[PDB]
C-alpha cells in the first residue's frame, strides 16, 4: 500500500563500486595511502573499525535480542503516562474487581458528627484555595503545574492539624519519589504495573477491612464486562525486555511499609496532556491494585489464592479543581481466571471542590460583576478528603 517516508529523505544509495574491483588478480590503486580523497583514484574499502576501549559518551548498546533480559512472551506494562481507552471498564477487567459507586458507610461515618470537623473548616479551606491560585507566587495568575501540588500538600497539612484530637495520626508520614512494581496474569497475559510519581501516605498499622466475608463471597455471581473488539491491553507498553519482579519501593525494615493513601496529580498546563476523568480513575485503580498486590506477595508469598486478610489501599486523584476518591480492597491473588472471588472498589466521581476561581475582578461597564475568589465552593468535597485521612486513626 502507501509506504511512509519519501525516498528523497532516506539515505542515498552508496556510490557504485569501481570496475577495477571486478577484475580478479588485480590490485586497485586507491587514495588510502594519501590519507585524503582525490577524484582520479579508486575509492578504497575500509574494514569495520572498533574503538577497542569503553567510552560512555560514545556507547552503542547491543542489539535488542542480545539483551539478557529478553523474553519472547511480551509483558504489557502500565505506567503513569499510560492513557487507557475504555477507562475504568478496562481497569476493572485487568484487576478483576467490582465497582461500587459511593464510599463505604464506615469511612463516611468518621466525619458525620460535628466532633471531628476542623476549627473554622469552611474558612480554612477557602484560604488553601486562594493561596494556591492567587497568593502563592509573584505572577498574577499561577499555572496549574504550580498550584495543583500546593493545594494538595496544604490540604494534607490542614488535615494533619487534628493530631490534638487523634494522637494516632503521629504514626504516619507522606513519602515522595517512591516507586513500586507488581506482576500478574489475566487470561494468559503477562501484566505489570510500575507506579511512580505522587505522594505515598505511609503508616505503621495496616488499614482494616471494609467488606465482610459474606460480601466477598457474593462477588462470585458478578461478571466482568467486555468491550469487544477493543482489547484489554490497549494503550499499554508492550515490552519484550523486562524482568518479572515485585517491589514495594522500600527495603525490609522500613518503619512505614503499609501504604495508606496514594495522591495522584494531573499537573499539566495543556489540556491535551492532562488525563480525562475516566482515564484518571483507572490509573488510581491500577496503582492502588499494584500497591496492595505488592504487600500481599511479600506477606503471603508468591502464590495465587484467595487472601485470608484482604489488603485495603486508598487513593485520591485531583486535577487541582476536581477530586476523585477510591477505596480498593484486595480480596484475592488468583486473577488468571475470570471466575471466583473478585476484588472490590468504592469510587466517588467528579467531586468539585470549587467551580471556578477569579484571580482578577471582572469589571463590565465599570461594574464589578464577579470579585476575586472561589466560585461554587462545596464543603462536602473536603469532608470526604478528611474522612479518607482519618480512616484507621479515629
Amino acid at each position: 500500500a502507501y509506504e511512509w517516508g519519501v525516498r528523497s529523505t532516506r539515505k542515498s544509495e552508496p556510490p557504485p563500486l569501481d570496475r577495477v574491483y571486478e577484475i580478479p588478480g588485480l590490485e586497485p590503486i586507491t587514495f588510502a595511502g594519501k590519507m585524503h580523497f582525490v577524484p582520479w583514484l579508486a575509492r578504497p574499502i575500509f574494514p569495520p573499525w572498533d574503538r577497542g576501549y569503553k567510552d560512555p559518551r560514545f556507547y552503542r548498546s547491543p542489539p535488542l535480542h542480545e539483551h539478557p533480559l529478553y523474553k519472547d512472551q511480551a509483558c504489557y506494562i502500565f505506567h503513569h503516562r499510560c492513557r487507557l481507552l475504555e477507562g475504568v471498564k478496562q481497569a476493572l477487567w485487568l484487576t478483576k474487581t467490582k465497582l461500587i459507586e459511593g464510599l463505604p458507610e464506615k469511612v463516611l461515618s468518621l466525619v458525620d458528627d460535628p466532633r471531628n470537623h476542623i476549627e473554622n473548616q469552611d474558612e480554612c479551606v477557602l484560604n488553601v484555595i486562594s493561596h494556591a491560585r492567587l497568593w502563592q507566587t509573584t505572577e498574577e495568575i499561577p499555572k496549574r503545574e504550580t498550584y495543583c501540588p500546593v493545594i494538595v500538600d496544604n490540604l494534607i497539612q490542614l488535615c494533619k492539624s487534628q493530631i490534638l484530637k487523634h494522637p494516632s495520626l503521629a504514626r504516619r508520614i507522606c513519602v515522595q519519589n517512591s516507586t513500586f512494581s507488581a506482576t500478574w496474569n489475566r487470561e494468559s497475559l503477562l501484566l505489570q504495573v510500575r507506579g511512580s510519581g505522587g505522594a505515598r501516605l505511609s503508616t505503621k498499622d495496616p488499614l482494616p477491612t471494609i467488606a465482610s466475608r459474606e460480601e466477598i463471597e457474593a462477588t462470585k455471581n458478578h461478571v466482568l464486562e467486555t468491550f469487544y473488539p477493543i482489547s484489554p491491553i490497549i494503550d499499554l507498553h508492550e515490552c519484550n525486555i523486562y524482568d518479572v519482579k515485585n517491589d514495594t519501593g522500600f527495603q525490609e525494615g522500613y518503619p512505614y511499609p503499609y501504604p495508606h493513601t496514594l495522591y495522584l496529580l494531573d499537573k499539566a498546563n495543556l489540556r491535551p496532556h492532562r488525563l480525562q476523568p475516566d482515564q484518571l480513575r483507572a490509573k488510581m485503580i491500577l496503582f492502588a491494585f499494584g500497591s496492595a498486590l505488592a504487600q500481599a506477595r511479600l506477606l503471603y508469598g508468591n502464590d495465587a489464592k484467595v487472601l485470608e486478610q484482604p489488603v485495603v489501599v486508598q487513593s485520591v486523584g485531583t486535577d487541582g479543581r476536581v477530586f476523585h476518591f477510591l477505596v480498593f480492597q484486595l480480596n484475592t491473588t488468583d486473577l488468571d481466571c475470570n471466575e471466583g472471588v473478585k476484588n472490590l472498589a468504592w469510587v466517588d466521581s467528579d467531586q468539585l471542590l470549587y467551580q471556578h476561581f477569579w484571580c482578577l475582578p471582572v469589571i463590565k461597564k465599570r461594574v464589578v460583576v464577579e470579585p476575586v475568589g472561589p466560585v461554587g465552593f462545596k464543603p462536602e468535597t473536603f469532608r470526604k478528603f478528611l474522612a479518607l485521612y482519618l480512616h484507621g486513626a479515629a
Binding site: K34, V38, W49, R51
Partner: protein, 181 residues
C-alpha cells in the same frame, strides 16, 4: 611567596644594578638534565621580577634601572631551551631516525600550491571524520592558469631585483673608478 616577584628591597630606587653575564649555550652542554630543569625555574623567577619592574616603570613614568638584565635572562632561557631540544633531537634520530618530532606530509591545497601539512591528534580514523573529509588536498584544472600567473609575477620581481643590482654596480664605478680591478 610574593616577595620573589620583586628585587631585593635595598635595590629599590637605585639607577643601576650590577649583573653578570648571560648563560651561553656551550656552558649549558656540561650540566645534567636535572640541573637544567632546576635552572629553568631559577631564570623563570628572575624573568618575572624583571617583567614586573618593567611594567611598574611605565606606570610611574620612569626608566627601568638596568634593562639589559632582562635581555640577558631571555638569551639564557633561549640557550637552555636550545640545548635540551638538541639532546632530544639527537636521541630521536638514533631510536627512530625522524628529523621532525611532529608528523606531517607534503600536499597540494585547494589553491594548487605546495604546503607542509602538520597532522593533528584524533580519536577516530580519517575515513570516518566528517570535518576532515570536507577539506580538499587536490587542485582542479582551473588552477593551472593562476599558478602560471603567480609564477610569472615572481619572475618579474626577481628580474627587476637582478637588473637593479647591476645598475648600482655600474653607477658605483663612475664615482670610484679605481674599482675596475
Amino acid at each position: 611567596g610574593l616577595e620573589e616577584f620583586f628585587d631585593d628591597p635595598k635595590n629599590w630606587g637605585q639607577e643601576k644594578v650590577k649583573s653578570g653575564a648571560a648563560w651561553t649555550c656551550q656552558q649549558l652542554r656540561n650540566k645534567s638534565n636535572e640541573d637544567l630543569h632546576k635552572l629553568w625555574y631559577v631564570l623563570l623567577k628572575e624573568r618575572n621580577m624583571l617583567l614586573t619592574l618593567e611594567q611598574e616603570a611605565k606606570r610611574q613614568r620612569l626608566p627601568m634601572p638596568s634593562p639589559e638584565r632582562l635581555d640577558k635572562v631571555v638569551d639564557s632561557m633561549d640557550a637552555l631551551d636550545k640545548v635540551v631540544q638538541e639532546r632530544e633531537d639527537a636521541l630521536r634520530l638514533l631510536q627512530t631516525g625522524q628529523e621532525r618530532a611532529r608528523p606531517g606530509a607534503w600536499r597540494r591545497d585547494i589553491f594548487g600550491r605546495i604546503i607542509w601539512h602538520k597532522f593533528k591528534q584524533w580519536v577516530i580514523p580519517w575515513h570516518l571524520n566528517k570535518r576532515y573529509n570536507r577539506k580538499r588536498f587536490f587542485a582542479l584544472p582551473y588552477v593551472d592558469h593562476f599558478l602560471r600567473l603567480e609564477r610569472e609575477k615572481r619572475a618579474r620581481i626577481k628580474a627587476r631585483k637582478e637588473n637593479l643590482e647591476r645598475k648600482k654596480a655600474k653607477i658605483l664605478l663612475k664615482k670610484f673608478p679605481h674599482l675596475a680591478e
